[model samples]
Target: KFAEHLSAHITPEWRKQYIQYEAFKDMLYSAQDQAPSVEVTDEDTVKRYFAKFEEKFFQTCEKELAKINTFYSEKLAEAQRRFATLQNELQSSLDAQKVQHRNIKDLKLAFSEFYLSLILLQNYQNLNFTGFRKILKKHDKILETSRGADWRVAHVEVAPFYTCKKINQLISETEAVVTNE
Candidate 1:
């Protein structure tokens, strides 16, 4: 709740002010569509979302780097300053643990990349199990937009995501092609 205040706020008056200050192209959504040319409605919203996402992503990356730098710098200085062998050993142990953590994270990312490739292959062949289209489609859309899967939130990445719809009901709608059979 407190973190919400850290982000930029978009006001209604801000939109009106933007329209007054900026020059925008009257782009058509489609040749056939007769909808009014929106100035700062849909496009602005979409752009804001993407811009915020990107800003946060890079900010996170920099924060992580700064933390790492601060850690290593302090450790190096401490090592030089302190004469106790126990402190040195403890510091070394901590550093090793951190290194192991980083290795595990890298391996996890690499493993996901390999597994997602297999999932993509499955989709390419349309060989997903019954009612698996929804999950596959979601994955497809994620890959199309995000270029990678970060299934840390609610989405259990370990399991091959599938359509949650009942298999029997889905199978009834369309029969599987059985030419060889």
Candidate 2:
């Protein structure tokens, strides 16, 4: 259900940027099938299985994080560029005393779209954060291990996609610009 919901909720152009939740879930289920039984007494086999899983799990997480970080960084840069362009246009209009009604309306429309883009980026962060936590929790449940908790704290919480404060700051900046104009 989450996979479907994610698919539906993600931006059409950014569908590829999202975590492959359904595919990752499939991998988890397949791994679960081959996992050592709960009653198995061979500590080495269990250890080996978990060790291998941990390696694969972390590698996948790293890959996803890279993808997310790259996309988010690019989008943020683009937003900043647009904001600069808008600020210049606004300043020029004010200096020339040529702020026509049509120009003002277009500016409002542009800022509205800009605000929407920021909202979408925020949603992007939230959706992926939730996806990571849900998948990790499922991993913990399947493996009967608490590693997911530690991993979530060490990796997910500190991940750029989760910890970046710039988006919030940009939202506020956009708000101030829109309000002042």
Candidate 3:
């Protein structure tokens, strides 16, 4: 179970690098432990021989290191630019949609507030032309998000419905009062 859990997190790329690094480290340690067993009379000769091999190894490592630096430099720069563009687009879309939702809420409140005043002044009949048009606009805005039940529940199920009823009721009451007067 422990091994299973550990292996689950190890991806192919990471496992490959881990195996290569551990194998190289093991080879280096083995060479250090086996160094004294070589049948060489002079210590200086062995030192000189190993020094040449070490120098060649280091030179190759340095050349490859330069290539790696160039590879990572290009990769990092490209990743940074792409990330920035993605962030810019993400924020742009979020801001536009957020502001639109806020404007809709604000419009709903504005229309509701006017309801009381119009009903008091017996001018609720004025809503037939422009007030109802505003409700249709709000309906359009709600449907713009989606035509499904969730969207209707969020925008259509309550706020717009209440706004329409409030306006229509006021208009009906005003007409009744005017007719009786």
Model 3 global lDDT (CA atoms, 0 to 1)? 0.42
What global local distance difference test value does model 1 have?
0.36
TM-score of each predicted structure versus truth: 0.24, 0.81, 0.36
**Which tens-of-lDDT digit does each residue in 16-35 have in candidate 2?**
89988897899898787888
The lDDT leader among the candidates is: 2
Query: Using alpha carbons, what is the TM-score of model 3?
Result: 0.36
CA error at residue 54 for candidate 3, angstroms: 1.6
> Which residue runs does candidate 2 get wrong by more than 4 Å?
36-42, 165-181
lDDT of each: 0.36, 0.87, 0.42
- As a whole number from 0 to 100, the lDDT of residue 20 in candidate 1 is 13
Model 2 lDDT, full chain set? 0.87
Error of 1 at 26 (Å): 37
Candidate 1 local Cα displacement, residue 19, angstroms = 41
Please give the lDDT score at residue 133 for candidate 2. Answer: 92
lDDT tens digits by residue: candidate 1, 1-181: 2112211222332222111101111111121142323474577765565556445433433343344334334534454454354445446656777437675565556556555544443342222121122322343353254421343122322222222346696675556444334
Candidate 1 vs. true structure, TM-score: 0.24
Give the candidate number with the greatest TM-score.
2
Q: If both were scored by TM-score, which would come out higher, candidate 2 or candidate 3? A: 2
